[PDB]
Each structure stands twice: as C-alpha cells, then as structure tokens.
C-alpha cells in the first residue's frame, strides 16, 4: 500500500542476446519467438538485478528468449485499435523513416 | 599424511572468461567481482580437470 519499494531498485541489464530489451517495440522483425522463465537449452537471457540506494548489487531472476530469423512477425510500438491495415506518414519536415 | 596424491594431478583449465585466473594478481583494474562456487546466471567459469 505504502510504496517501501522507494528505496529498492529492480531493473533489467544487458545479457547476451544480439539486441536489447527496450527496442524490440521498434519495428524489429523476426519469424517466431516464444518467450519463457524457465530453462530452455539454447537459449540467450536477460538476467535482473536488485539494490538498495546503488550499493550493493545482487542478481535475482531472468528472463529466456528463443527466436529465429524471418519476416513475418514484427514490433509495433503501441496498439492502436480501429485501423484496418497499418501505416503512418508523416511530411514536410524531418522523420525517421 | 602419506601424500596418495603423488599420482593424481588436479589442476584447472581455461574457461570462456575474457581473462586468466593467475593473471588477476597481476595490475588488473575491476569494478565488483563477487566470485561462487554455485550455478548464477550471466557469469562465466574455470572448469577444474
Ligand atoms: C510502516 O508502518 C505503517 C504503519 O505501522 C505501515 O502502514 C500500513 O501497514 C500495514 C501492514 O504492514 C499495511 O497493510 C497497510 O497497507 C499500510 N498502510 C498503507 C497506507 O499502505 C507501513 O506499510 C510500514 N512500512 C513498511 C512495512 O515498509
Ligand atoms: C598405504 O598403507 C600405509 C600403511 O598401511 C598407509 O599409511 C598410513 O595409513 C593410515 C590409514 O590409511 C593413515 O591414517 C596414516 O596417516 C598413513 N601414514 C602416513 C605416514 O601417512 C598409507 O596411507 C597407504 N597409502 C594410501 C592409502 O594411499
Ligand atoms: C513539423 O512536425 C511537427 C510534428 O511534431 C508538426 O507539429 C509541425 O507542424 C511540422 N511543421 C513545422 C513547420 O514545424
């Protein structure tokens, strides 16, 4: 209720797959994935880290993640709902297409 | 007592570790180290033969 979580700090570092946690909701494309918390061999991993005002650091959990290259399955950045077929375009001044 | 082991020759090997174990005595500059003997995630290891 009252957030003793404030002083505690539990996030995410950088492991040994070939890409990042954060980015994968840009427009990355894959053929199929199948995310898991448990051990699968051949596997990469995102291990998780937790510490107390940056001290002392620890290392708690992970998350394991398969994949395979393709084009079929691709991050989207947000649900947008409604539209029938995805696509944005914006003009006139500086994007990042 | 009687050293038995005059035989046996129990030493260790190199691992996939981007360094070498009796190098570390040697000027090496680190941040945090924390060594185990039990399985943690994201760490690299010694075999021992
Ligand atoms: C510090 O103590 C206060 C009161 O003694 C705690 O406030 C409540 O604690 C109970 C039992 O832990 C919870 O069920 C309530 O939800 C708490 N109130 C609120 C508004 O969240 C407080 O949690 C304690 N701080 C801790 C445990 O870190
Ligand atoms: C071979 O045998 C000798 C004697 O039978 C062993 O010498 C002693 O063995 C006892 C029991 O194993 C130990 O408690 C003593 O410490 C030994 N003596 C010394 C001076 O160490 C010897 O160890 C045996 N060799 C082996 C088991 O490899
Ligand atoms: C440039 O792009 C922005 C998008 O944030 C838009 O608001 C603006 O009208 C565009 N044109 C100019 C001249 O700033």
Redesign the pocket.
């Known amino acids: 209720?009252?957030?003793?979580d404030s002083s505690w700090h539990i996030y995410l570092k950088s492991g040994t797959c070939p890409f990042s946690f954060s980015k994968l909701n840009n427009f990355q494309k894959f053929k199929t994935i199948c995310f898991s918390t448990v051990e699968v061999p051949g596997s990469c991993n995102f291990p998780l880290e937790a510490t107390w005002h940056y001290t002392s650091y620890t290392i708690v959990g992970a998350l394991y993640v398969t994949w395979s290259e393709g084009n079929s399955i691709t991050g989207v950045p947000y649900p947008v709902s409604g539209i029938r077929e995805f696509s944005n375009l914006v003009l006139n001044n500086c994007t990042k297409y």
């Open positions: 209720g009252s957030p003793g």
